[PDB]
Symmetry: D2
Subunit: 343 residues, 4 copies
């Protein structure tokens, strides 16, 4: 930026290596960053009481899997409490993942704040004091961060104020992260409220992504040292029209290549409620698109990698091998369907 650049050559280089190594060889991201309430909601499906010990146990099973998981998982997103826990043997989770070669990341948003004068749409809190938190995390073996911005499709939604505020919050987050050495993961998530179709979701996603990357350019954010976590362009789950993997893949790649620059090293997809098989098939169809796709499309999956694991665990011991294999199978399936090599 001539006289006042945001980063230096070393910082840009380090950010690019981190961002590329997360998605280096078809690898994805395990999103084990659920909060206390989110993890309680996930645990309620298998009649397991929500407590810190259960979260520690399940995350220990997730992070103590066979060492051939760096071939399918390149990064793990964590929560603040989960990063500092210990396994049963007495070493840190962030070190177990580090010796496996998996890159470590942290959730960095503090939540939602109502936006007055708007139809139930919010902005994201977490910006004040984020630089110190990011510096502490970078000291504490964390290489990337994640920030989620929710934009809803409803009557008069998303408004110009919501789009502008969310895009600028994501851009300021990303600039802070890159200033502290962390790779930012922008997650502009478009959630439909009323009934809609594929074309409207694609249009709104294109608008959101255009505003997001315009804000990122405005804040001088290094695009080669950041990742994108968008939702796949789908419809409301309470809709008669069920879209095949081909139509979803065409819609999402069409939305992405119109708005997302080629400087972004990789686009890791979220789930947002899709089944594991549907997410895998959709991502496989995404990677089989004839469109340019100048990025490394991959997965940043939550429930999709932790649905059979929860069912196999049940909150009980002696199911460690079953949970580890259930997570192994889903990780391998998504890694296969991150290069268009899934049957």
């Amino acid at each position: 930026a001539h006289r006042f650049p945001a980063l230096t050559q070393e910082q840009k280089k380090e950010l690019s290596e981190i961002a590329q190594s997360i998605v280096a060889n078809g690898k994805g991201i395990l999103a084990a960053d659920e909060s206390v309430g989110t993890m309680g909601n996930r645990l309620q499906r298998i009649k397991v009481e929500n407590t810190e010990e259960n979260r520690r146990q399940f995350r220990e099973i997730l992070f103590s899997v066979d060492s051939s998981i760096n071939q399918s998982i390149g990064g793990v997103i964590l929560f603040h409490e989960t990063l500092y826990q210990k396994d049963s043997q007495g070493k840190l989770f962030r070190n177990i993942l580090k010796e496996k070669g998996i890159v470590v990341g942290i959730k960095l948003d503090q939540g939602g704040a109502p936006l007055a004068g708007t139809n139930k749409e919010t902005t994201i809190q977490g910006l004040d004091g984020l630089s110190e938190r990011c510096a502490q995390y970078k000291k504490d073996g964390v290489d990337f961060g994640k920030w989620r911005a929710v934009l809803r499709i409803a009557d008069q939604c998303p408004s110009s104020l919501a789009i502008q505020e969310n895009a600028n919050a994501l851009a300021r987050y990303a600039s802070i992260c890159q200033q502290n050495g962390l790779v930012p993961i922008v997650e502009p998530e478009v959630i439909p409220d009323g009934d809609h179709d594929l074309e409207h979701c694609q249009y709104v996603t294109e608008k959101v992504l255009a505003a997001v990357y315009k804000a990122l350019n405005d804040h001088h954010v290094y695009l080669e040292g950041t990742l994108l976590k968008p939702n796949m362009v789908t419809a409301g789950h309470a809709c008669t029209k069920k879209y095949t993997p081909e139509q979803v893949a065409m819609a999402t790649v069409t939305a992405l290549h119109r708005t997302v620059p080629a400087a972004v090293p990789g686009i890791c997809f979220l789930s947002g409620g899709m089944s594991e098989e549907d997410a895998t098939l959709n991502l496989n169809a995404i990677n089989l698109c004839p469109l340019p796709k100048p990025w490394k499309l991959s997965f940043s999956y939550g429930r999709a990698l932790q649905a059979s694991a929860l069912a196999a665990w049940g909150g009980k011991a002696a199911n460690k091998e079953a949970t580890q294999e259930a997570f192994m199978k889903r990780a391998m399936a998504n890694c296969q369907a991150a290069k268009g090599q899934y049957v």
Copy 2:
């Protein structure tokens, strides 16, 4: 405002009464909201060490003046610690001010954050967890809040990013305050940071105010329940060209009436380094301008009201009568030069 208004009729009415009552009859604002470092800097000039007891004592003298100070002071801005401090007889400072009829306000920004890729330009932190703080203050007998945004005039300053981010932060602050019932005091302060002239400072102030009120309109902020705290349009003290009260008054009123709507009940001026006599004469000349001036121009003075009080106190007891008279006289002089009646 057809389907999703920001406020209701009762909230709008209450905000308008609070904002007008702050500046009802030529009354101003005493800015006794200096932080620990700021109050230490103020105390250092009279050989008094900075401590929590000295800050308690001086504001104890300031808030224990004769009851005929509501005729000159309509609002007092406090700090978080000073709000909960108590009088020597065991009464809260905010309760003392409330029985005197003076409206209570609180500083509500958490500080400055560097803006990457900019020439030493900063944004303002304090937005996350501001609704809860404002609700707590409203339950705690606080009726208005203040938020400062600093814009500098330098090489390639202010940039578009700085103006946009600061204006949007001020607008989000104001919307949060109005949602919690507090009257927001926008303080866009354009600091010189150079040897620029009156024309450039006036131009930059007009740009800042236009962007600030555009952002306020974007965030649906009730303009009748806000106050503005702008700097008087002056030049950098490094430059050798002085400006008479007439030139300063013409420049600042010219900048204000091109950008500040008539809905704003009153414009209270800050000082930012002016002497007490200079501030009084400048505000007198401001209120003697032939221009329309649809607001109630007043003062929101810090050091300007607490400079002779510091010199009369000296950190010692038995001089509190001189401290009260040096603040009584200065407040009365500014109230007199808040309606063009000062000789």
Copy 3:
């Protein structure tokens, strides 16, 4: 603007004198600028054929009125063909008005252009070649110009694109006019397509005006040398509930004082289909508002000053004095109800 000001002291002074002299003593604007199709539509109501001769004759009757009309009319907006017409003798219409003391203005837009991807929303053409036309008009005894931008209220109307494009077109027009010495008359007209409410119309008008003056500030437009021509906040003819002059005045002044700066010398209102009596009563109620109103509210009326004139003329000969008296009566009534003196 320090290093690169838009205008000089002489240009700013001349623009301010022109703009103030248009609205000097409660005087309004006669909007006799109907195009060929528009004037034909207005002539069709009295069963007279549309031709250039009839247009010349009726405006000859309008401009051949007693020289006391300078006490009620301060400016006349003409069309391009009407400006160069003659008064049946060797003296032009523009000179007829100039020796009468009335300021001369010209319509300066070419009109609607479809805006793709929008719900029937349009932008305004006229920008290319505007500087040369404005210079020619200024050489031709024209002192102000007018530009109309239409924004509609409908489903997803007004959109952000329509608001931004129309505001920027108005600002670019105003900058060109002030560069050529003409006083620009911004006419942001909000037309409702459906059954709207008073609150919705007020909110949309505030948004439009805030964006318009933000764009005007962005383009460095001298606000003291320009006029505003807004529509009163009213209801459509299909609205179930009628709005009294007090309510319309309340909504109009409330919308104006939150967004229109005090630098604007005067606000001249348009009609947009309201009757002459209703326009007069509404403008009287507007000028009787207890709100600040730092401008000189007046009228820029079209059909409201040429409704009884058309009905008295009828296209026939020797029915001139009736047209003269009707136009004089309407102009005097509106001038009386431009300072709150109309009973």
Copy 4:
């Protein structure tokens, strides 16, 4: 969009085929669209007088080349006067090019207009009446159009106003062109005025392109049916340090892939005074870049394809085959570079 899309499936498909066929197999664009003054300036270098007959003759030599030129040239940009000329025979120039397989395009901007309050930076005229002109050209066998917007690098240049106005003008141009069936060629040209750096030029180009494509998305412009005509990130002729083809290539592609979406079918480069050999070497180095480059990089060259042609012609008769061979050689070399196969 869901309810108000800019184009239909047939219009989008036709625009896609036209835009891709212009750049189908490494083919470029011959920019023989010089205006009367521009063509006179280019003719003055070989001591020939400027007249319509000389332009007709030289355009005849350019368009009467062997039919294998469709293997190197996929589109020709013409002027309004040039499109309607004849081949000294029955056939028109446009039909001569059409039966050669070359796509036809037209210049569509009226040109610079001073932007008041700015440092000598202008906006572009041509928007009013553009829809009718584009419809006439589409009826006249013209398949694409071109529009140039100039932004300067100087003190306070480019300003926010210049960037925004030029980007929005380009977007409105492109939307009109796509509504009329023409493929728009955006030409955001950044020209330095002074002594700049490669880093500064790259940064300014990135900001310009980000704003341009944000405006294009704001106006709902089909990105798969448009082309981009940027200048290579180079240095001025007064720059102390010369930049190698490798450095220029990297800077250009680095600027392009951070801001230009993958939906854009091809990026055709201009010359801007860069010599014929340097343009070919730089384009070959650009096409040899290891960066993603999801587009079809090619050339839209003016003087670069018409410098040896002008020197071989000299305005004399019977010096035609030399001009044919020079133009063929330059076109073939630039096509080889556009395929990255130029040695």
